[PDB]
């Protein structure tokens, strides 16, 4: 099974705006380029987020990491047995993403996924944030999480759990209208409460948002002000019911895609009980 | 196997007396109603104890929790293989108990059991006790425990262990008369020393008592005085030989059903050795 | 010297609104009455805040605590030597405030102060909050703090430091207009970063606000939502530069008097260096 | 000033009953005799409690310890300056109490006090309790405490504080009748919340009770049962408002003198604030 | 497999001498009798060592504990499969040893073994040592250990490992004469470095010695002096190479059987590497 | 007495080279300018190091901090009593250094010193290093230290100790030639092993070097490589005998002035014993 | 699978130079001889490194340890199944290496390997270093590591992983020339980041170097100076990218074989992710 979410690639209309957003606002470290993709770091990895020009203004691919070569062949076997089409990344792609091997596939609704092993680390170029952020919580929990929009949550659930090995943490019924709610399913594949959530939102984007976790509450507080100065805040500070991440939300430069910048969630394990929540926020998160 | 005891429902003759008892005396939080049942909370769960009108003046049902949907189907399989009759809770029942799925059955002596998964949590309405109690120890150990009266301990034991997956912790020989004792069997299904004890007491009730565990010794001390002011104390403070819960006992408003309010027990695991004790109390617990 | 701020008395136009505000919103425990004053508790003390009817809609008095009878006589000596008028609280007043002895005086600008020793504690009636708040940080640091408006900060400073024994922690230049700032002086008399701050604000009230410190960040988060539901929020969540209290502000029912509800500040001692800050907030606290 | 209470001597009508009481019930170690006094140990000291035959059935003397020879001469100087009569213990007395030097005096109401230094320790005969008690909390806090009955609390207070250097911790108003209470004053001379309390009780004895502090709550629980088997319990388990000792009370064999056997109190220091309490118990301690 | 050594029974010529030895010297608690056996306690168990009259002056039986009824049936199955004769303890024997079930067998060289489950605990009669010893280390590691003399170590090894499930920890070559050594094999069945050691010593007894582990180094030091006063010391204080127990040895009243009284050994687990040592002592243990 | 070294000002020939050196190499944060001085930060202070153009290529002034206004007047009194000339910084100077008050003087050999209180902090502009350094150890220990060259160590010693209140930590005899050594005296004024060392080196500069302390050993390791890439290393990694700072040395752009970048020293207090060392390095620090 | 590297044997041209090197420089304890091999200790083992005369001037054999006799037979089975030739060490060899059993084989490129169990420990002759080194980190992680030169890394990898059970930790691309790098594969068999690394270096030796890990950073610092005094340093202090060992390198007396003396690495487990690094050093390690 997938061990963690390791990287994200966005294809966007305003590369400079994304560059400023990820560095001066979010605090990531600019790390050069690979092909037409600008690269950004959050830790020791050669890169975590890639930004390339494109009309999509959306997530273009997600990297799903495994721990070694044999694990990757086992994922190939799982894909074959499940009838899921995939191709093996060629040398150029391997070089482009800085990995030792990868399988290219899509989820049932067209999001390209890349299952890989052997990513590049560059400890000789220690991480230096572009804005005051003490650091990000990554490690075995990967880069963070994202909320995947899908037209059929049950169909998406079967794929992510049965094929990729993610596990359901819990569900939140997100009230949309007076008598309309959407059951968001939160899935884990390691200690991070969730790495991918699945929801049938009426949004045209592949994802609703991606989440990064910072080391301290002040990191979050300071980041709020930077995004507020940029005019991008979409939520006040708040804390989620299920993972208890204390965060705020802001718009990325791609319309309808937000970022969640947070701190201090609960983590999970094999004893996590599936439960249901009627609200996204235990406190705060008022929409603005 | 069952992971924990999650809820209890009582059917009683004096609903107002039970309401005052659970709130002003015990300290639980009133949490509205579902159908004709008044609901009470001890933590983040939407409810833990339900009280409905009825002539039984007894425990009407017990909710036995599992961690996910697949676990529930596996319990269904265990019931089928064991020849234990059960039905699937319909939508109305699921809505009534605020769960995602449930199986309805009885133990061999008529106590209705509900095996469920996916309970509702309401972190946006943080727990507020009705009396000075710092909190209850629940979490993975469930709401607490109860002592189930049975006519045939061996028969009850086979069902709870072989069918439901509980495990024997230890036995106490409870001296009843000059040359008469009853062997109480204490069963666990998680870290709580026991969740269900089985005993052939000559009492007309389904249970002898239910137990709640508070966070501090002062919680217990203060609760003693509140129940004493109410004229309900049945035991002085004391500590059990087997789980070493330091507690007192009091009458509930239903005759012959008591409550045990305690603190600081030992917890168990796979290395817990079956042992036998000749007394219920290491110290205290004098009957009054 | 004064050891800590122990109590506050308000004289207000809307006693019921203050009652609801302190209980359902802030979380204090209603504790009966003394004379025409409604009493509120935050801990083991018989009372911490008193609310009496009056047109002032302001702080009517502040209780400044010392540790014993001899300390009180020494404060009397300090007042005499400094030429500050004072009277000794009579039996009725002692009974009213539940103290063993008190001196009644005013600060140079008319705020009545009561220096006392021997307050009443009622551990047999353990604290029970009226809203979900885990508890307040009081103890040797007293009930909290307040910001005292004065027409002459230097004059006020001499009195609070030379006569009462408070000590300057630091200064914040609070920008009021384009080319106008007010130098707020923050004074301590124990580990609390400040107990009284002195500022020449153009506000008609004796105080700008009073501050209570809760045990957890969630206490603060939950309280924000309760005050927001009441329509009283005046600041978003934020953190101060000098004491690093993470808080929000809200209006009390008395116009121009606010409450600050906070968590997690730095504490001080004899090694605290006087420093100057150009902003009140390290992050957040946007005015709304 | 006095550093700690080091020993107590009782003169009683039933020496065998006291012997059984201190050993089999309380758990002290029999330690032979000195003259006509039977000796009992609680720790490394050669003795802590002495029992001699006499019609008093009361406390005959209390040993007040200082840390060295010079400290004792300084106490002599304090007594001289205060006009308090005293004599120097002769060689026989020094040998009898196993000390290097002592001053013999009385408090203003006739209780003999012995101020001493240089007590004997016998680590080569390690402490062995006579009943199951894990140990007593003594050390720098001395053997324990006692409540001294006096006809004039103010007079007693001046002596214990001004002459002997004890310090007021707090006061409890002990309700005796419908409209009658006695203000008990609790005095410390080290970390123990109090070593001597002063109260104008209408009891014919020099003391109301003496208190010993055990290491664990189980020590207390087990001791309760032993004293209950002996028919001596006078209070149920409970916890005091001021020192928060969790204890029970029992009769000694001398009528109107009780023992308090407790655990887990708060300790004090130079920052302890004088406060007043309206009840002796935060919870429990119901009289039986 | 066997979980721990739970009890030992000796058959001796001088019951009074053994009684004094186990109580006044070793510190065990006398606990009455069962049949013609005097019982001794080291902890919460109703008994740990039994002493009965007999000419053997040797270990008469050893109790090997398992955690539950099913485990005992599994041991029965192992014995059957291995062709090892055994009988089921009858009611009288079960009553005599205070257990819920037992299998009676012998090791290949005639030492009676009793495999049992469900021992009696008596927490209402808390442990009280007969001599100054703070306590013994037992719990999941059982009562202690013994060194079993055998004529054929390989044969004994096969039985204890293959049949009973003990595991080899390490070996010490014990030099007997100028060119003669005996390879002692140390076996564990839990965290205790060893519970049974196997050695081909030329001693007529079933065992060379049994070992008890005390809580502190002072326990050991004080015990040394008590056994020295009794004229029983056989070794000076020392520390073993393999388990690093710091101990001394003394004679029991049965000739050629000693006791080892120790403290502070290393404990083991599944990662313990088999190693060989050329000496029994890292330091000390000089024979006297 | 002086509490800590708070700031340093350099007057240099190559401002751009110093700018690159302090930011890209050392890791300090550029913080704008005040007058013709470029400012650099290491923490929450508005500035720590100032660089202005000048032919000196040397330390132009050192800021010595005290905790409050009264402390500054007391230093003025000490200067007056000692006959040391000083002037009071005017408004322009106060504005320039961002302090509430300052005294301007020189040490006996012409180094300008500024004794000040009330420095500016800017927590709303959190520290962001210009190179990968996790942070600096400052706080109550000030910015760091420097080694002051003097022609007469005894004369310098009398001034720094008797007038400014520094305290001798220890001495190192620094071997210069075959039969020539210089006794460097290391002085503290807080927990930092030394803040100023005094040595009669034959160097034309006011100081031999200044020292900054980083949070981790990796900070130091990474910094070494950055300075090595710049061609500035003067010592290999090493650790001092007296403070046990683990550091390396590098040239600043001003000839004969170096920087020491270190980690992990011992800290001092009132119990630090004056001792003498024959070498500067316990290990390493080979000159290159 | 192999549990750890337990010993190394070198065959060298200058035995005295190796003797001085391992004792006076590295700090190992001389431990006599076995046959023509001089023995050296690093801990409780009778020996860790053996040095015998020979023209090879290279590693002559490596001892690979397993935990018991059965484990060794299982390794024999693995060798048989894989078609790898091996012989059983005879009595003389067993005596020579001080082990209870061993299999002699070679890796695919001629390095003799000895798989063994039951090594000799000599706690009665406690370790005494020959130079100031506080101790070495060995225990379950074995003596240390070595870098094995091979002509075919894939072939070597298959043998060490598939046959011996080592596991790939990570890879470093070691740049040799302008457009030439060698992919070093680092393998673990316990918590030590690696025990054997495999690399196709163009060196005539079996190994590039062996590594020892000392307890403290000062151990490393002091050792650097000792090797520098000997003229043997080949690298400055530095820290590796992958295991983060902070070390230096020095020449052994055998040309082209070095020693790495280090401290403070990361350790591994089953969750270690295979990653790739482009440099050997995160910082330092400049070649000299």
PDB file of C-alpha atoms in Angstrom, chain F residues 83-174:
ATOM      1  CA  UNK F  83      35.915  59.655  37.890  1.00  0.00           C
ATOM      2  CA  UNK F  84      35.068  58.198  34.503  1.00  0.00           C
ATOM      3  CA  UNK F  85      33.902  60.823  32.037  1.00  0.00           C
ATOM      4  CA  UNK F  86      30.605  60.243  30.270  1.00  0.00           C
ATOM      5  CA  UNK F  87      27.887  62.118  28.444  1.00  0.00           C
ATOM      6  CA  UNK F  88      24.175  61.465  28.107  1.00  0.00           C
ATOM      7  CA  UNK F  89      23.063  60.386  24.666  1.00  0.00           C
ATOM      8  CA  UNK F  90      20.887  63.061  23.151  1.00  0.00           C
ATOM      9  CA  UNK F  91      17.538  62.458  21.473  1.00  0.00           C
ATOM     10  CA  UNK F  92      19.099  61.918  18.055  1.00  0.00           C
ATOM     11  CA  UNK F  93      21.430  59.237  19.402  1.00  0.00           C
ATOM     12  CA  UNK F  94      18.607  57.583  21.345  1.00  0.00           C
ATOM     13  CA  UNK F  95      16.579  57.513  18.137  1.00  0.00           C
ATOM     14  CA  UNK F  96      19.556  56.216  16.176  1.00  0.00           C
ATOM     15  CA  UNK F  97      20.195  53.246  18.481  1.00  0.00           C
ATOM     16  CA  UNK F  98      16.504  52.662  19.266  1.00  0.00           C
ATOM     17  CA  UNK F  99      16.912  52.877  23.058  1.00  0.00           C
ATOM     18  CA  UNK F 100      15.173  54.744  25.889  1.00  0.00           C
ATOM     19  CA  UNK F 101      18.342  56.138  27.437  1.00  0.00           C
ATOM     20  CA  UNK F 102      22.108  55.859  27.167  1.00  0.00           C
ATOM     21  CA  UNK F 103      25.417  56.973  28.608  1.00  0.00           C
ATOM     22  CA  UNK F 104      28.360  57.432  26.259  1.00  0.00           C
ATOM     23  CA  UNK F 105      31.878  56.790  27.567  1.00  0.00           C
ATOM     24  CA  UNK F 106      35.113  55.039  26.619  1.00  0.00           C
ATOM     25  CA  UNK F 107      37.093  52.261  28.202  1.00  0.00           C
ATOM     26  CA  UNK F 108      40.614  53.281  29.307  1.00  0.00           C
ATOM     27  CA  UNK F 109      42.031  52.543  25.866  1.00  0.00           C
ATOM     28  CA  UNK F 110      39.570  54.372  23.666  1.00  0.00           C
ATOM     29  CA  UNK F 111      36.822  51.878  22.841  1.00  0.00           C
ATOM     30  CA  UNK F 112      33.510  53.747  22.904  1.00  0.00           C
ATOM     31  CA  UNK F 113      30.959  52.125  25.144  1.00  0.00           C
ATOM     32  CA  UNK F 114      27.279  52.911  25.337  1.00  0.00           C
ATOM     33  CA  UNK F 115      25.412  51.880  28.492  1.00  0.00           C
ATOM     34  CA  UNK F 116      21.703  51.750  27.727  1.00  0.00           C
ATOM     35  CA  UNK F 117      18.260  50.546  28.693  1.00  0.00           C
ATOM     36  CA  UNK F 118      14.967  50.061  26.897  1.00  0.00           C
ATOM     37  CA  UNK F 119      15.862  48.596  23.504  1.00  0.00           C
ATOM     38  CA  UNK F 120      13.303  48.161  20.735  1.00  0.00           C
ATOM     39  CA  UNK F 121      11.850  44.744  19.950  1.00  0.00           C
ATOM     40  CA  UNK F 122       9.862  43.935  16.799  1.00  0.00           C
ATOM     41  CA  UNK F 123       8.037  40.629  17.286  1.00  0.00           C
ATOM     42  CA  UNK F 124       5.628  41.619  14.488  1.00  0.00           C
ATOM     43  CA  UNK F 125       8.570  41.151  12.071  1.00  0.00           C
ATOM     44  CA  UNK F 126       9.738  37.692  13.163  1.00  0.00           C
ATOM     45  CA  UNK F 127      13.413  36.837  12.624  1.00  0.00           C
ATOM     46  CA  UNK F 128      14.242  35.284   9.239  1.00  0.00           C
ATOM     47  CA  UNK F 129      17.872  34.224   8.718  1.00  0.00           C
ATOM     48  CA  UNK F 130      19.598  34.995   5.404  1.00  0.00           C
ATOM     49  CA  UNK F 131      21.392  31.632   5.388  1.00  0.00           C
ATOM     50  CA  UNK F 132      20.533  28.247   6.948  1.00  0.00           C
ATOM     51  CA  UNK F 133      20.997  28.781  10.659  1.00  0.00           C
ATOM     52  CA  UNK F 134      18.292  27.593  13.045  1.00  0.00           C
ATOM     53  CA  UNK F 135      18.822  30.549  15.388  1.00  0.00           C
ATOM     54  CA  UNK F 136      21.244  32.187  17.812  1.00  0.00           C
ATOM     55  CA  UNK F 137      21.560  31.872  21.553  1.00  0.00           C
ATOM     56  CA  UNK F 138      20.997  35.364  22.907  1.00  0.00           C
ATOM     57  CA  UNK F 139      18.275  36.270  25.413  1.00  0.00           C
ATOM     58  CA  UNK F 140      19.594  37.172  28.876  1.00  0.00           C
ATOM     59  CA  UNK F 141      23.112  36.322  27.672  1.00  0.00           C
ATOM     60  CA  UNK F 142      23.112  39.132  25.114  1.00  0.00           C
ATOM     61  CA  UNK F 143      24.275  39.030  21.496  1.00  0.00           C
ATOM     62  CA  UNK F 144      27.535  37.190  22.173  1.00  0.00           C
ATOM     63  CA  UNK F 145      31.077  38.186  23.141  1.00  0.00           C
ATOM     64  CA  UNK F 146      34.228  39.856  21.967  1.00  0.00           C
ATOM     65  CA  UNK F 147      37.957  39.732  22.735  1.00  0.00           C
ATOM     66  CA  UNK F 148      39.253  43.236  23.513  1.00  0.00           C
ATOM     67  CA  UNK F 149      42.915  43.969  22.784  1.00  0.00           C
ATOM     68  CA  UNK F 150      44.522  46.137  25.484  1.00  0.00           C
ATOM     69  CA  UNK F 151      48.056  47.404  26.238  1.00  0.00           C
ATOM     70  CA  UNK F 152      47.665  46.837  29.994  1.00  0.00           C
ATOM     71  CA  UNK F 153      45.472  43.947  31.131  1.00  0.00           C
ATOM     72  CA  UNK F 154      45.596  44.914  34.823  1.00  0.00           C
ATOM     73  CA  UNK F 155      44.417  48.440  34.042  1.00  0.00           C
ATOM     74  CA  UNK F 156      41.640  47.114  31.761  1.00  0.00           C
ATOM     75  CA  UNK F 157      40.659  44.526  34.404  1.00  0.00           C
ATOM     76  CA  UNK F 158      40.203  47.142  37.135  1.00  0.00           C
ATOM     77  CA  UNK F 159      37.879  49.162  34.882  1.00  0.00           C
ATOM     78  CA  UNK F 160      35.710  46.299  33.634  1.00  0.00           C
ATOM     79  CA  UNK F 161      35.410  44.683  37.075  1.00  0.00           C
ATOM     80  CA  UNK F 162      35.396  47.612  39.536  1.00  0.00           C
ATOM     81  CA  UNK F 163      33.525  50.130  37.399  1.00  0.00           C
ATOM     82  CA  UNK F 164      31.302  48.040  35.091  1.00  0.00           C
ATOM     83  CA  UNK F 165      30.769  45.047  37.388  1.00  0.00           C
ATOM     84  CA  UNK F 166      32.087  42.258  35.167  1.00  0.00           C
ATOM     85  CA  UNK F 167      33.517  39.216  36.961  1.00  0.00           C
ATOM     86  CA  UNK F 168      36.601  37.152  36.155  1.00  0.00           C
ATOM     87  CA  UNK F 169      35.765  33.619  34.950  1.00  0.00           C
ATOM     88  CA  UNK F 170      39.220  32.295  34.163  1.00  0.00           C
ATOM     89  CA  UNK F 171      42.537  32.820  32.415  1.00  0.00           C
ATOM     90  CA  UNK F 172      44.222  31.154  29.453  1.00  0.00           C
ATOM     91  CA  UNK F 173      47.956  31.564  28.856  1.00  0.00           C
ATOM     92  CA  UNK F 174      48.097  31.911  25.112  1.00  0.00           C
TER      93      UNK F 174
END
